[PDB]
Amino acid sequence: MSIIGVGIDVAEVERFGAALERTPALAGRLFLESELLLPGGERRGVASLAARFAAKEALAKALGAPAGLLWTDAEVWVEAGGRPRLRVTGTVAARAAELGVASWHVSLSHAAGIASAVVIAEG
Amino acid sequence: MSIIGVGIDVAEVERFGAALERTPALAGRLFLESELLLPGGERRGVASLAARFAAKEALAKALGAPAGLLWTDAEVWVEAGGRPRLRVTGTVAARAAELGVASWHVSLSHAAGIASAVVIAEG
Amino acid sequence: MSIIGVGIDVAEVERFGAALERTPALAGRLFLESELLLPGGERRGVASLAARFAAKEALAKALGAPAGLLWTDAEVWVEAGGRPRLRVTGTVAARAAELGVASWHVSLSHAAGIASAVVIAEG
Ligand SMILES: CC(C)(COP(=O)(O)OP(=O)(O)OC[C@H]1O[C@@H](n2cnc3c(N)ncnc32)[C@H](O)[C@@H]1OP(=O)(O)O)[C@@H](O)C(=O)NCCC(=O)NCCS
Ligand SMILES: CC(C)(COP(=O)(O)OP(=O)(O)OC[C@H]1O[C@@H](n2cnc3c(N)ncnc32)[C@H](O)[C@@H]1OP(=O)(O)O)[C@@H](O)C(=O)NCCC(=O)NCCS
Ligand SMILES: CC(C)(COP(=O)(O)OP(=O)(O)OC[C@H]1O[C@@H](n2cnc3c(N)ncnc32)[C@H](O)[C@@H]1OP(=O)(O)O)[C@@H](O)C(=O)NCCC(=O)NCCS
Ligand SMILES: [Mg+2]
Ligand SMILES: [Mg+2]
Ligand SMILES: [Mg+2]
Ligand SMILES: [Mg+2]
Numbered sequence A, B, C: 001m002s003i004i005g006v007g008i009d010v011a012e013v014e015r016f017g018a019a020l021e022r023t024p025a026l027a028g029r030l031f032l033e034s035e036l037l038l039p040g041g042e043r044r045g046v047a048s049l050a051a052r053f054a055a056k057e058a059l060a061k062a063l064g065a066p067a068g069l070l071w072t073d074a075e076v077w078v079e080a081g082g083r084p085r086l087r088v089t090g091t092v093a094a095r096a097a098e099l100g101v102a103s104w105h106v107s108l109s110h111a112a113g114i115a116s117a118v119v120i121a122e123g
């Protein structure tokens, strides 16, 4: 295998929270039900959601961000140890197949009011 | 192939714009004519230029930033879909050959007053 | 080989400096003697240390951040040309072996009050 694409994205946490609050429908357009909850069942916070949004944008960049990708066709899930993972379906899986992507790698960070993500697509 | 180097760079957009304005000659030392324009023909903005500068610094880091690299020997170009790409020539191509680099991967982001880039060299 | 993990981390420089000053013992828990010095022998500054901390956090993320990793078992060292490198020992080396990691790639940046690092584990 080799690298097919890389993406980076930085989101301003305050700006992202304001966007979610402005339009009630927005959270459900960007996130699956599972992404909106913490492992315990509590509602996921704004910085953590902003990092997940950054991850989806970074994923889109790694694929050359064609038209037709659905936010909900990229899912950030979490291993027991706390590690974030990408699962792709539908439109995002189809674009990944066009490019030959077999494996996804992601990391998230949030500090100083910004949420950051890096995504590497390999295949 | 495998990874030969990775680079990251973050630039403060306001500081970068101030530098360009202070010294008229600076833009032409850092950027090719093509990089200074948008696809339509309009002049590229400061945040976008700062991200391109960050990309060139990240590229230099991926190569171990030896003396003798010219800014103008790294070019950020843009696919129809909007995706940024690196093309290397001259001094930067020669250093890349020393290390066996065959492929370049880049992504750019700008938010909250900062421009960010990640570059991976593979070969 | 292929990619085993990626990590990113962003640290607020001011917050990190305040933490070091608050607890004298903290620097020695996070850093080896060698990391606390510049090539010349002078004491390494706060932004540079914050970037090294970010690197160790990014490394931990690339390995899935299990319990039991020691800060001091990840070392940032510097090539003559100025390039940062990772050397892993003990607990961090053992976790890397569990995952099959043969090679480490790191880059650091600090601007606009934030220190950033990206780490890729390959094997
Ligand atoms: C293009 C997009 C990925 C950019 O991400 P963003 O977080 O909004 O903005 P960022 O500052 O982080 O990134 C912008 C950079 O990404 C890069 N980018 C743009 N198009 C890209 C593509 N086709 N592939 C890879 N990278 C792309 C560019 O380098 C751009 O900077 P530049 O124009 O100065 O060169 C994003 O806006 C998007 O998903 N496009 C559609 C917008 C939209 O309708 N929202 C999503 C729902 S469909
Ligand atoms: C070295 C250079 C790449 C750093 O990038 P920058 O955007 O200016 O500063 P950043 O904060 O983002 O990066 C600094 C970090 O990059 C790393 N860096 C320095 N030298 C490096 C090299 N040889 N290879 C890879 N990374 C290097 C270091 O880890 C450094 O942090 P540290 O000294 O605390 O360990 C950059 O200053 C440069 O191009 N060097 C020459 C300066 C110059 O004259 N300008 C360019 C025209 S020649
Ligand atoms: C988990 C840890 C790596 C996070 O790094 P940080 O710089 O403190 O915080 P960041 O904002 O940069 O990163 C947080 C993100 O990292 C990711 N992360 C958490 N656990 C992870 C793990 N097991 N593997 C990979 N990434 C992980 C998550 O995506 C998290 O965001 P989310 O919970 O919203 O999804 C770090 O706190 C740590 O080393 N854990 C132990 C804390 C500690 O005691 N200090 C270190 C001495 S043992
Ligand atoms: Mg963005
Ligand atoms: Mg953004
Ligand atoms: Mg820099
Ligand atoms: Mg910088």
Ligand SMILES: [Mg+2]
Binding pocket: A109, A110, A111, C009, C010, C011, C057
């Ligand atoms: Mg962190």
Ligand SMILES: [Mg+2]
Binding pocket: A109, A110, A111, C009, C010, C011
């Ligand atoms: Mg952090």
Ligand code: NA
Binding pocket: A089, A090, A093
């Ligand atoms: Na499916």
Ligand code: NA
Binding pocket: B089, B090, B093
């Ligand atoms: Na040439």
Ligand code: NA
Binding pocket: C089, C090, C093
């Ligand atoms: Na050892």
